[PDB]
Amino acid sequence: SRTVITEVIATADSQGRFLNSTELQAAFGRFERAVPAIEAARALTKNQDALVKGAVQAVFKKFPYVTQPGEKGYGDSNQAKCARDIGYYLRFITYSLVASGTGPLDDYVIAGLREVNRAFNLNPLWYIEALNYIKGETGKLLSGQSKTEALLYIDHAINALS
Amino acid sequence: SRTVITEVIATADSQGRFLNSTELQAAFGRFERAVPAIEAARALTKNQDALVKGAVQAVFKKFPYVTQPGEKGYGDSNQAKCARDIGYYLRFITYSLVASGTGPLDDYVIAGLREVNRAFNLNPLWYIEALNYIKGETGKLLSGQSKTEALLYIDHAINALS
Amino acid sequence: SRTVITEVIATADSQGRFLNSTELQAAFGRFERAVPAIEAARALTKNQDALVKGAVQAVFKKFPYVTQPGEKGYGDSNQAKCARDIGYYLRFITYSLVASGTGPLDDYVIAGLREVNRAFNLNPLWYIEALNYIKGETGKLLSGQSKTEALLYIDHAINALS
Amino acid sequence: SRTVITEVIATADSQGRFLNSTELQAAFGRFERAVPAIEAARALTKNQDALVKGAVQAVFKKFPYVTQPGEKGYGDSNQAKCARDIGYYLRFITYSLVASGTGPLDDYVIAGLREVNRAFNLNPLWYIEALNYIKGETGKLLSGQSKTEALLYIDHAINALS
Amino acid sequence: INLRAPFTSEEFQGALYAIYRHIFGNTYVMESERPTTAESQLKDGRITVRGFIRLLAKSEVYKSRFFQKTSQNRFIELSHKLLLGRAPYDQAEISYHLDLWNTQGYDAEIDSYVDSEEYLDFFGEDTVPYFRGFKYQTGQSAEGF
Amino acid sequence: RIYKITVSEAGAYATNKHRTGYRAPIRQSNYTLTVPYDRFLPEMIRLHQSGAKIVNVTSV
Amino acid sequence: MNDVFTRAIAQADLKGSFLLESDLDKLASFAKEGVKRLDAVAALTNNAPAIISDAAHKLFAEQQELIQPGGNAYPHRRMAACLRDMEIILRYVSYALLAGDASVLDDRCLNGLRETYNALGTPTQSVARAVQLMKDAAMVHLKSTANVTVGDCSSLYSEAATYFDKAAASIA
Amino acid sequence: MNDVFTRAIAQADLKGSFLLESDLDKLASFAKEGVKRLDAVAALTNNAPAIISDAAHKLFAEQQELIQPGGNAYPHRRMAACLRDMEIILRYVSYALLAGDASVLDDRCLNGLRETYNALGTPTQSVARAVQLMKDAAMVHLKSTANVTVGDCSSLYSEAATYFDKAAASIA
Amino acid sequence: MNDVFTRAIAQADLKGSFLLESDLDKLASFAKEGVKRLDAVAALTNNAPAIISDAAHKLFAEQQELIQPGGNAYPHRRMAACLRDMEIILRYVSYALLAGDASVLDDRCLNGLRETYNALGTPTQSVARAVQLMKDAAMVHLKSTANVTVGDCSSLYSEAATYFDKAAASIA
Numbered sequence A, B, C, D: 001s002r003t004v005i006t007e008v009i010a011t012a013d014s015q016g017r018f019l020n021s022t023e024l025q026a027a028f029g030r031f032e033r034a035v036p037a038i039e040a041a042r043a044l045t046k047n048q049d050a051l052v053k054g055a056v057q058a059v060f061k062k063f064p065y066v067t068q069p070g071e072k073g074y075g076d077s078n079q080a081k082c083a084r085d086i087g088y089y090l091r092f093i094t095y096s097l098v099a100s101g102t103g104p105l106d107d108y109v110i111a112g113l114r115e116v117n118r119a120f121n122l123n124p125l126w127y128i129e130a131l132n133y134i135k136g137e138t139g140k141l142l143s144g145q146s147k148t149e150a151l152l153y154i155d156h157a158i159n160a161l162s
Numbered sequence E: 001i002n003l004r005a006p007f008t009s010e011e012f013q014g015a016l017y018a019i020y021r022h023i024f025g026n027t028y029v030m031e032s033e034r035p036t037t038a039e040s041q042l043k044d045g046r047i048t049v050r051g052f053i054r055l056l057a058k059s060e061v062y063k064s065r066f067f068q069k070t071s072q073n074r075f076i077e078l079s080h081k082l083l084l085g086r087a088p089y090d091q092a093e094i095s096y097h098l099d100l101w102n103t104q105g106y107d108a109e110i111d112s113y114v115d116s117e118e119y120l121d122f123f124g125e126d127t128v129p130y131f132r133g134f135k136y137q138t139g140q141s142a143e144g145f
Numbered sequence F: 001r002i003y004k005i006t007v008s009e010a011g012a013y014a015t016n017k018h019r020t021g022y023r024a025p026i027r028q029s030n031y032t033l034t035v036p037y038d039r040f041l042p043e044m045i046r047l048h049q050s051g052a053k054i055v056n057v058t059s060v
Numbered sequence G, H, I: 001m002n003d004v005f006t007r008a009i010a011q012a013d014l015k016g017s018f019l020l021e022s023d024l025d026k027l028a029s030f031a032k033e034g035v036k037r038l039d040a041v042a043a044l045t046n047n048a049p050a051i052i053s054d055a056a057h058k059l060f061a062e063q064q065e066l067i068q069p070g071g072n073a074y075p076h077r078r079m080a081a082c083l084r085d086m087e088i089i090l091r092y093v094s095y096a097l098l099a100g101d102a103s104v105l106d107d108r109c110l111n112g113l114r115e116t117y118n119a120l121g122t123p124t125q126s127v128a129r130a131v132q133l134m135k136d137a138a139m140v141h142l143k144s145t146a147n148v149t150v151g152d153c154s155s156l157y158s159e160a161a162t163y164f165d166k167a168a169a170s171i172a
């Protein structure tokens, strides 16, 4: 996936050359930022269930018209799939935090996102609201830099959805 | 010039996207590693004259044959050219330290190096010896990560000559 | 390889057409040039050992330092490799004389010459000196068109080295 | 125009290299076979009118139905254009003989021949018969390498027509 | 890789590396075989990536490695792979290109690849060719993959 | 000989790209290409088919 | 393609001399405050669609003639092209902000844009207005003191404003 | 590609040795005979359409099934391809005659031609037959004494025949 | 691309006449001293690194400002470009010398060279001086009588001087 180290190696390889000062300094930055990013992922993993339940509830509060009979938000299967989707997004956000790159998101979620959402008539706004929630509670869950990395990745997901 | 920032921005623009975490961590590493690099550039700029004279003398010690008449090293003009070339290499090493990239070295020395040396029958081994002397001296007058920066750039130049 | 007949046939082949008067005239000229060329090749073959020994000695005369210990000419194996390389060059010059094209040289010596010299730290001026000696000597062993043919091939090899 | 010299230079230019023994030997063959070719060209130029008139009469002998009214040959103007066409073909054969390559023929006759002859409904068999007459008279007007060169060029024109 | 008209030295050298790795089928090209005049013309702006690729395909390196020791079948499939990034879709391509080379020579055959609408749609004068056929292409024949 | 064709795109190329979608990276409109005489006609037809606008052609 | 360090090195090489201690101090300062630079670039990137949407709403509220039939942004694809151009300008402005040098914006995005618009028939003045509107929305988003520790970044605000104004000037 | 000289050089290189005096003598004899070789090649080139037409007429009189509907030279297209292939093979035979080596014929013309014809449904026996008829017509033209100086050229005849029958053997 | 023979053919064609007897004598003369010209072409070809190195040494002694920082041969990259350009110009001069005509030198080498140099900041006077220095070195090498039969060759030296001067005129 597209991370700092993998981009470094891909650029070095595409030009057929070794790793020089620039590439090693980039990798050094990755290895320093690993600490805030990894423990932000730890904090996000710990509070995953509450975050997912709250994101689903926020979707329903903003979109009450999905849950009454006849459309996407109705039924135990649909709501379970909603929980599954928000958990997917959170999982890949934590993956991206650990890997220090949007490679997990870009490769697993964002690639093909619009075609899939169009085919199944899933509104991207639902997931935008869920991720905005996730952002709200990661603001209070996380402090200092960890908050910063988690916000960068959550917002990359949001931007891709919008 | 290839720096961490320029490579960041280039790999972002090639695929037509905004700069994201994968790019900002790389830039962060550059900004953090600037301090030892600027220290090394300061030290190498202070001591340029001693380094250049010592490098020229090291070249003549390793190649006594070149000073003999009818050879490249004979004459006052040729040795003036030698001192000037060592000054060029040291200057570009300091530039590359300041920019935190091999971009200055690559642009001003490494590009067209082989063709120029073959055209004028300049043996790259002379400059390997001069740069090896400069490396030995840089082991002094510098300590810690600044020495690591300086030797990484110097030995980049050495590998390009070899 | 890459010789007059082969260029003729390749040009006809790529243009999807037969061999016409222009190409047959090129081939004609090759067939008459074969006489001084084969004579030069035979003369050089008969005197290969004298030429090779003299070339090695001229190399050592022009570069006295190389025989000194710690250098590329020190030792018996290094000088065995001297003579082997000069024999290689002589062999491929005779090949090119017989083939009436530079294709033997280009395919066996020149293609990969610079990289191999740079890797093993061999100096192209050594081989230029040896080929200059061979040129001077074939000035004596040969005369007329035989000598100009030999000199064209030896000079192609020299220009390849430089 | 494709001549021996021009093919030489174009090949070397495409490879971005100097003219070496191959190119020079092809040029030498051209310069050697120039003299019988120029002899043939002078011979064919001298007997222009007889050759052209005989070729026209031969066309009319092999194609009696052409001259009768209601056909392409009937009339003074079409007669004049017949004579003109055979004269053009002879002229460009002499050009290609002098220039030691079929380039004049390819540039001035062969290129666009089929579509021009289709648009004006000119039978290639008429010109093939005229050229066969030209060959028949060349057999006695010339002897040796001059006759060989002239036959090569005339029958190149024929093969282009057929 | 995309190479615009004002380009840096590192971008230029990387583009050359990519172009040689693709157009020459991952074959080692020696320093004596590299086209310095064509590189100069590309560096100036006299030609584009496309015209540079056309030059390289007409060059003796390409001819010797892919045309002069092969059958026309191998040359056609290999030219499709290297210049279009895809495989031939049917036998009509083989027949078409063989007739093209036979009647108009090698240069016209290269020009068909490089002046093709496929090439211009996907690479278009500034991007290096790449392998497309590892993804579904419209009009593909399911055996092209 | 060689001819320099200066090309522009004032909307026909734009609408063709809008229908097909951006498919190689976007580039500026006005640009010039040098073409030999042998390739002169096909390049001209290709530009006309693409919706390109040629503002002038120069011979050199 | 340069940054502040590469530009300084370029001038140093034209004079033919080593970098001066004043220059070293200046660039060390640039690298010390590059943390704020990363915060500003992240703020520009994370809010890019919001900036573009806000600027589009403002521009189409003010310049109503574009929307109407016969306007430059009427055919629905031309609206798509308008949005794409706005995003490209924002992307290159953020590139230049991170570099600290405006050359990456110019040489790659702005050198031919004027002639492109003129050949097309696009009103360049409305494009400049869109760039200024993007500048306003971007200033609002960078100055957001939340999400980051409070600090003095007037230099970043000035630099971003210069990049937006220079893009607008080159367009119109 | 290889001519006779380049093969000789290749074996000499494989041994790592110079070219012996006998090998140089053989190459000298080749280059002396080169003018006769040129006459043979020009006879093949100059009279090529006649050779192809004669071979086609004989072949399609012998094998009428080829030109009936359902034959493999029935529609105009397949007949054009048939004549094209015959011209191509004769042209590579002329190349091999000039080079003194059958290497170009193998590498270019007969590299995979049998599998090509097997996949097309083309009768390889009939293709070989066409190559034999072309060989006969070629020998008729190459033995012609008009417009050449009389001499012994039997080695060239046998070598041309070997190129022809090597093509026919590779096909069938 | 044109030589003396095709030049005469074109001049005859524009009038639509057979090449005159006088033209045949001049062309046969050109063909007789073709061997004389091959030696000059080989002298240019063999000694090209020597000619270029000599001219470069003299040029960079005469004009130091090219090699200091800010000059146009200053970095290795521009220095290599300059050496390459000298290589190319000598190559095309030798092509013209072999062809007997300067049409190649106009068509391929110098078609838009002065404009390129003007756009790149290259002092065309420096390039013209470089061509003149190569002309001096080339004349030194062509006149060498070693390894060649003695004969009058003032025509070849004059013609090569015209080629070098014409190249310098087109660049400057």
Ligand SMILES: CCC1=C(C)/C(=C/C2=NC(=C\c3[nH]c(/C=C4\NC(=O)[C@H](C)[C@H]4CC)c(C)c3CCC(=O)O)/C(CCC(=O)O)=C2C)NC1=O
Binding pocket: B059, B066, B072, B073, B074, B078, B079, B080, B081, B082, B083, B085, B088, B089, B108, B109, B116, B120, B122, B126, B127, B130, I056, I057, I060, I061, I067, I073, I074, I075, I076, I079
């Ligand atoms: C920007 C980077 C740059 C470099 C590195 C550079 C090296 C360089 N050194 C040169 C001169 C030279 N430099 C030397 C160096 C020798 N002196 C002896 O004392 C030693 C054995 C040895 C040095 C260790 C010599 C012998 C020459 C003269 C070469 C000649 O013209 O024959 C020249 C040719 C000057 C000319 O055109 O007249 C170059 C290009 N030039 C550049 O623009």
Ligand SMILES: CCC1=C(C)/C(=C/C2=NC(=C\c3[nH]c(/C=C4\NC(=O)[C@H](C)[C@H]4CC)c(C)c3CCC(=O)O)/C(CCC(=O)O)=C2C)NC1=O
Binding pocket: C056, C059, C066, C072, C073, C074, C078, C079, C081, C082, C083, C085, C088, C089, C108, C109, C116, C120, C122, C126, C127, C130
């Ligand atoms: C087909 C043509 C061909 C050539 C030309 C060729 C040259 C060649 N010579 C070599 C050895 C060598 N050649 C030399 C050079 C000689 N010794 C010095 O004293 C003299 C100044 C000089 C005589 C001119 C040396 C010193 C070595 C040993 C290098 C080493 O192993 O480090 C090597 C290294 C590989 C080995 O160990 O054999 C190569 C590649 N190889 C080839 O396959």
Ligand SMILES: CCC1=C(C)/C(=C/C2=NC(=C\c3[nH]c(/C=C4\NC(=O)[C@H](C)[C@H]4CC)c(C)c3CCC(=O)O)/C(CCC(=O)O)=C2C)NC1=O
Binding pocket: D059, D066, D072, D073, D078, D079, D081, D082, D083, D085, D088, D089, D108, D109, D116, D119, D120, D121, D122, D126, D127, D130
């Ligand atoms: C330089 C190369 C060149 C060639 C070869 C050439 C041939 C040529 N001959 C023409 C006329 C013609 N030429 C002929 C020749 C016929 N007259 C009969 O006595 C014969 C059976 C037969 C000739 C053997 C005829 C019938 C026409 C009139 C055709 C027409 O107007 O449709 C034309 C049409 C131009 C016109 O009518 O204004 C061409 C192009 N032109 C060229 O520029």
Ligand SMILES: CCC1=C(C)/C(=C/C2=NC(=C\c3[nH]c(/C=C4\NC(=O)[C@H](C)[C@H]4CC)c(C)c3CCC(=O)O)/C(CCC(=O)O)=C2C)NC1=O
Binding pocket: E026, E027, E028, E029
């Ligand atoms: C994934 C990156 C990558 C690799 C690893 C790679 C290896 C590689 N080496 C090759 C040739 C070669 N490789 C070798 C090396 C061998 N010769 C022996 O003597 C040695 C014991 C041994 C080396 C240790 C040789 C000699 C050839 C050329 C064979 C020939 O020319 O006939 C080739 C064929 C391309 C060509 O011939 O031009 C490839 C693909 N290429 C790549 O793109």
Ligand SMILES: CCC1=C(C)/C(=C/C2=NC(=C\c3[nH]c(/C=C4\NC(=O)[C@H](C)[C@H]4CC)c(C)c3CCC(=O)O)/C(CCC(=O)O)=C2C)NC1=O
Binding pocket: E071, E072, E073, E074, E094, E095, E096, E098, E099, H066, H072, H073, H077, H078, H079, H081, H082, H083, H085, H086, H088, H089, H108, H109, H110, H113, H116, H120, H121, H122, H123, H126, H127, H130
């Ligand atoms: C450059 C070397 C080379 C050659 C020569 C070559 C031959 C070749 N011949 C082909 C077809 C053909 N070839 C023939 C020839 C046959 N017709 C009758 O059967 C005869 C017995 C016989 C000729 C005497 C025919 C009829 C076709 C058309 C087959 C079809 O459409 O099914 C094809 C398939 C593409 C096409 O239709 O043109 C190839 C590739 N391939 C190569 O790479």
Ligand SMILES: CCC1=C(C)/C(=C/C2=NC(=C\c3[nH]c(/C=C4\NC(=O)[C@H](C)[C@H]4CC)c(C)c3CCC(=O)O)/C(CCC(=O)O)=C2C)NC1=O
Binding pocket: E134, E135, E136, E140, E141, E142, E143, E145
């Ligand atoms: C013109 C006719 C044609 C077809 C139909 C075609 C299909 C096709 N499907 C592909 C991949 C794929 N196809 C599928 C679809 C399958 N897997 C799912 O589970 C389903 C069970 C099932 C669909 C109902 C999937 C999942 C992939 C991705 C495989 C991978 O790359 O890992 C690919 C590889 C390139 C790509 O990923 O786009 C092709 C070429 N190609 C053709 O030329």
Ligand SMILES: CCC1=C(C)/C(=C/C2=NC(=C\c3[nH]c(/C=C4\NC(=O)[C@H](C)[C@H]4CC)c(C)c3CCC(=O)O)/C(CCC(=O)O)=C2C)NC1=O
Binding pocket: F009, F010, F011, F013, F014, F015, F017, F018, F026, F027, F028, F029, G066, G072, G073, G078, G079, G081, G082, G083, G085, G086, G088, G089, G108, G109, G110, G113, G116, G120, G122, G123, G126, G127, G130, G131
């Ligand atoms: C280097 C980066 C780059 C940029 C920025 C760029 C601008 C650009 N804008 C274009 C069209 C356009 N651009 C616009 C946008 C403007 N008109 C509206 O009034 C808005 C107010 C305003 C947007 C802020 C519109 C509406 C078009 C469509 C013109 C038309 O189709 O008539 C086109 C032509 C599209 C094509 O040929 O397919 C280009 C090339 N080109 C580039 O290569």
Ligand SMILES: CCC1=C(C)/C(=C/C2=NC(=C\c3[nH]c(/C=C4\NC(=O)[C@H](C)[C@H]4CC)c(C)c3CCC(=O)O)/C(CCC(=O)O)=C2C)NC1=O
Binding pocket: F036, F037, F038, F039, F040, F041, F042, F044, F045, F048
């Ligand atoms: C893409 C749109 C298009 C254009 C712009 C076009 C005109 C056009 N005419 C051309 C040549 C030509 N055009 C003519 C036209 C003839 N001269 C007069 O005698 C006749 C009255 C006149 C008949 C109309 C001629 C003689 C040439 C050849 C010019 C030469 O090579 O000297 C060429 C160059 C051919 C090439 O280099 O391959 C073009 C592009 N045709 C097109 O399809």
Ligand SMILES: CCC1=C(C)/C(=C/C2=NC(=C\c3[nH]c(/C=C4\NC(=O)[C@H](C)[C@H]4CC)c(C)c3CCC(=O)O)/C(CCC(=O)O)=C2C)NC1=O
Binding pocket: A033, A145, A148, A149, B021, B024, B025, B028, G035, G036, G038, G039, G040, G042, G043, G142, G143, G144, G145, G146, G148, G149, G150, G151, G152, G153, G156
């Ligand atoms: C992964 C990408 C990445 C980012 C985003 C990043 C930003 C970043 N911001 C920081 C604090 C800061 N952040 C800012 C930003 C300013 N504050 C004001 O409110 C302005 C609105 C705003 C300008 C946009 C400032 C002024 C500081 C404190 C500087 C200092 O520590 O002295 C710090 C240092 C915190 C510490 O270790 O104590 C970092 C590393 N670093 C990264 O590696």
Ligand SMILES: CCC1=C(C)/C(=C/C2=NC(=C\c3[nH]c(/C=C4\NC(=O)[C@H](C)[C@H]4CC)c(C)c3CCC(=O)O)/C(CCC(=O)O)=C2C)NC1=O
Binding pocket: H057, H060, H061, H067, H073, H074, H075, H076, H079
């Ligand atoms: C797909 C449809 C198709 C067509 C149209 C076709 C035409 C055709 N007719 C042929 C025979 C022929 N056909 C004719 C035509 C007639 N003879 C005279 O009585 C008339 C003047 C003249 C017609 C008006 C002639 C003269 C030949 C002789 C070819 C030969 O001798 O080999 C041949 C050569 C094969 C053979 O020897 O039989 C072809 C290819 N072939 C096809 O497969």
Ligand SMILES: CCC1=C(C)/C(=C/C2=NC(=C\c3[nH]c(/C=C4\NC(=O)[C@H](C)[C@H]4CC)c(C)c3CCC(=O)O)/C(CCC(=O)O)=C2C)NC1=O
Binding pocket: C021, C024, C025, C028, D033, D144, D145, D148, D149, D152, H032, H033, H035, H036, H038, H039, H040, H042, H043, H142, H143, H144, H145, H148, H149, H150, H151, H152, H153, H156
């Ligand atoms: C432009 C293309 C070109 C051609 C065509 C060419 C042919 C050529 N044939 C020659 C003689 C000859 N040609 C032949 C060959 C013929 N004798 C028999 O009738 C055979 C049927 C037939 C062989 C296929 C022979 C035997 C000689 C006598 C010279 C000798 O035997 O060495 C000569 C020497 C001078 C002479 O006696 O006329 C030449 C140059 N040279 C060229 O540059």
Ligand SMILES: CCC1=C(C)/C(=C/C2=NC(=C\c3[nH]c(/C=C4\NC(=O)[C@H](C)[C@H]4CC)c(C)c3CCC(=O)O)/C(CCC(=O)O)=C2C)NC1=O
Binding pocket: E037, E038, E039, E040, E041, E043, E044, I066, I071, I072, I073, I078, I079, I081, I082, I083, I085, I086, I088, I089, I108, I109, I110, I113, I116, I120, I121, I122, I123, I126, I127, I130
């Ligand atoms: C068709 C044959 C052909 C020619 C003739 C040709 C000339 C040529 N020279 C160029 C640059 C150059 N040419 C020179 C040489 C001059 N500068 C002065 O300082 C020196 C006195 C003088 C050395 C003799 C230099 C230094 C450059 C690089 C300019 C730059 O990078 O700004 C360039 C553009 C960029 C490049 O290639 O690096 C071209 C196209 N290219 C070709 O493909």
Ligand SMILES: CCC1=C(C)/C(=C/C2=NC(=C\c3[nH]c(/C=C4\NC(=O)[C@H](C)[C@H]4CC)c(C)c3CCC(=O)O)/C(CCC(=O)O)=C2C)NC1=O
Binding pocket: C033, C148, C149, C152, D021, D024, D025, D028, I035, I036, I037, I038, I039, I040, I042, I043, I142, I143, I144, I145, I148, I149, I150, I151, I152, I153, I156
């Ligand atoms: C393989 C490539 C090749 C070359 C290089 C070549 C040159 C060549 N030079 C020759 C003699 C000659 N060479 C020259 C050249 C002049 N002599 C003066 O010293 C000038 C310095 C010099 C000006 C360049 C002259 C004047 C002759 C005498 C030609 C004659 O006898 O009329 C000859 C004729 C030898 C004879 O019959 O006695 C040839 C064939 N031929 C080839 O096939």
